[PDB]
Amino acid sequence: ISEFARAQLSEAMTLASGLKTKVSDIFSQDGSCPANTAATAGIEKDTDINGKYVAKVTTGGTAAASGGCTIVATMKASDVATPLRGKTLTLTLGNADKGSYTWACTSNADNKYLPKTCQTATTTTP
Amino acid sequence: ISEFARAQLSEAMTLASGLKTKVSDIFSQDGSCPANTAATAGIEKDTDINGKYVAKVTTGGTAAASGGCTIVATMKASDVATPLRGKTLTLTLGNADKGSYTWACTSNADNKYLPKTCQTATTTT
């Protein structure tokens, strides 16, 4: 299991996490979710938010009383571990109508490469 | 003002008014004013009482002989006329010691966006 692959996803988490306050501020001020396909007040264009392994970081999502805004990092399509190429890592705002805002992490990459708090759970059924 | 601004404030009035019976029933049965920061018996959570233009409707206030319970509608922070964004419209219970419940309307919006019954009065001194 590649620890190099794990670190690449860690970069995506860090870059996505860097937008949490800016996105939460807009949600709390305006009750809306900012979208940065182009630069928008206070947030750079998604493709201008990048790293060594991350192509873009896109804010979006659908607003609900509980939150709903998303920050999605998309991995580069080369010079990245093959199972991560083009994959995404998503932070989603929640809890906004109950208590302190939360940011849940999910991803379409395999759990083996993800931080524990970003992994899905698989169970048997009856 | 515009028909749209009127419709927006009117939604607040309508949503707040939909809680009058429930609030007044609790004041009369329990003796205290219900608070719906969380859902409470008879009343939804404030943020679950919403509309096209209205973000939440909160019951509260301090009991007095004549009532005193409040129903406060908060306007959304977007998709509403700019001067109404985030403003509140308050209905306050009165006359409870005398007869039929009355509900006086106040607001923290500019008077020009409010119907006469909800407006403040300014005079020289």
Q: Show the CA angle centred on residue B24, arms to residues B48 and B14, nearest 5°.
A: 50
Kindly list the residues from chain A whose CB atom is less than 8 angstroms away from the CB atom of residue B55.
31
Q: A97 CA to chain B: closest CA distance, Å?
A: 7
Q: B74 CA to chain A: closest CA distance, Å?
A: 12
The residues with which A102 forms a beta bridge, in sequence order, are A94
Give alpha helix (H) positions in chain B.
Answer: 3-17, 20-30
Q: Show the CA angle centred on residue B60, arms to residues B54 and B64, nearest 5°.
A: 140
- Tokens matching residue A57: 């970081």
Task: Assign residue B55 a region (left: φ > 0; alpha: ψ between -120 and 50; beta: otherwise).
Answer: alpha
Looking at the complex, does the CB of residue B44 fall below 8 Å from at least one CB of chain A? no
Task: State which approach was used to obtain the coordinates.
Answer: X-ray
- Tokens matching residue B63: 């009991």
What gap in Å lies between CA B18 and CA B25, rounded to an integer? 13
Residue among B45, B55, B77 whose CB faces A29 most closely? B77
The residues with which A61 forms a beta bridge, in sequence order, are A69
Q: What is the CATH number of the domain that holds A70?
A: 3.30.700.10
Q: In sequence order, what DSSP letters do the residues of A45-101 get, joined into one string?
A: -GGGS--SSEEEEEEEEEEETTEEEEEEEEE-SSSS-GGGTT-EEEEEEE-TTTSS-
- Tokens matching residue A6: 């794990």
What gap in Å lies between CA A106 and CA A91, rounded to an integer? 7
Provide the 8-state DSSP code for A118.
Answer: G
CB A65 to CB B78 under 8 A?
Answer: no
- Tokens matching residue A31: 């009750």
What gap in Å lies between CA B24 and CA B22, rounded to an integer? 6
CB A65 to CB B77 under 8 A?
Answer: no
Quick one: closest CA in A to B38, which residue?
A98
Residue among B47, B48, B78 whose CB faces A32 most closely? B78
Residue among B48, B50, B77 whose CB faces A30 most closely? B77
Quick one: closest CA in B to A28, which residue?
B77
> Which residues are CB-neighbours of A64 under 8 A, at least 6 positions away?
none
* Closest to B59 in 3D by CA, of B26, B77, B27, B36: B36
Domain of residue A40: give its range.
1-126
Which one-letter amino acid corresponds to residue A59?
Answer: T
What gap in Å lies between CA B86 and CA A76, rounded to an integer? 41
What gap in Å lies between CA A43 and CA A33, rounded to an integer? 12
**Cβ count within 10 A of residue A45:** 14
Question: Three-state DSSP class for B112?
Answer: helix
Breaks (C-N over 2.5 A) in chain A follow: none
Looking at the complex, does the CB of residue A25 fall below 8 Å from at least one CB of chain B? no
What gap in Å lies between CA A58 and CA A36, rounded to an integer? 6
> Which residues are CB-neighbours of B12 under 8 A, at least 6 positions away?
B53, B54, B73, B75, B89
Give how many domains chain A has, as a whole number: 1
Which H/E stretch holds residue A5?
helix A3-17
* Closest to B73 in 3D by CA, of B56, B61, B49: B56
Residue among A29, A32, A97 whose CB faces B47 most closely? A97
Provide the 8-state DSSP code for B47.
Answer: G
What gap in Å lies between CA B97 and CA B95, rounded to an integer? 5
Kindly list the residues from chain B whose CB atom is less than 8 angstroms away from the CB atom of residue A65.
47-48, 50
**Cβ count within 10 A of residue A29:** 11
Question: Three-state DSSP class for B71?
Answer: strand
What gap in Å lies between CA A10 and CA A23, rounded to an integer? 20
CB A97 to CB B45 under 8 A?
Answer: yes
* Closest to B104 in 3D by CA, of B16, B6, B11: B16
